[PDB]
Amino acid sequence: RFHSFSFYELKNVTNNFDERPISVGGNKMGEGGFGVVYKGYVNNTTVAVKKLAELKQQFDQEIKVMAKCQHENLVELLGFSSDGDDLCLVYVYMPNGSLLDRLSCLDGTPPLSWHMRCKIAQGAANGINFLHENHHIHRDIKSANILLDEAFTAKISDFGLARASVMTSRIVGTTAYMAPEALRGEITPKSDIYSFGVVLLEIITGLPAVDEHREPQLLLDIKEEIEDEEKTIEDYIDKKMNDADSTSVEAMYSVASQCLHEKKNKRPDIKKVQQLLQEMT
């Protein structure tokens, strides 16, 4: 049972859903799937308000998954609003935004150290493990959906696509992260593992999963460059780190490589990924 907020209270605390950036004095923080996330202040708490823009089933799925799943490595839904057509989700505000933005150092934020990147990777694996233990396939594991709290704790977000554990006609997810079988219509927790392997590569390299002015454009393609000995993992390590040691970087790359196996059955389960990430430290 979450808090039922009135639409006018959410409109009020977000400066009428001010579309200008926080930097300019507005309330827009960014945009998710089919929604804009705004900053607000409710009952002496900084909140994130996602205004969705059928899509109602994605809203209900987000609430249903959050009602069941409560873990330290998952975002915390505080409440919601559904007055008519304009649907809102209220969460505890994550001071350090998304892992994607922090890896890119968006808005001048300093680079994440190797030590903090390891903590985030283990945290994200714990969050996925909780989802899988509770029979849920996320279907959209990506660095934009891994938020970071006031202590850089990884928080898996966006459960609008989540499914309770197979084929489907409506294929959903982010192409640059999707597993080969997910792109074909299969719904399996093994696809979540593949997507997590892409997140690990993003953590190691600091490169986005897709960059149209880059060769290769798809980050997952670097796994083949390394395997065909054209490049090494050292060549791709994020240069914006001063504490990355080769042994732990190669240990994390070994996990990413295992997650990115083209055969879904050859990939390790989340408990094994979680085990390997703890062994790394």
Ligand SMILES: CN1CCC(n2cc(Nc3nc(NC4(C)CC4)c4c(=O)n(C)ccc4n3)cn2)CC1
């Ligand atoms: C320079 N400084 C500027 C402000 C930054 N920042 C802080 C936040 N807070 C934030 N953002 C969220 N999503 C994104 C990433 C905006 C799209 C979410 C979110 O999606 N949910 C579900 C819950 C909470 C939440 N909290 C975003 N950016 C940090 C760096």
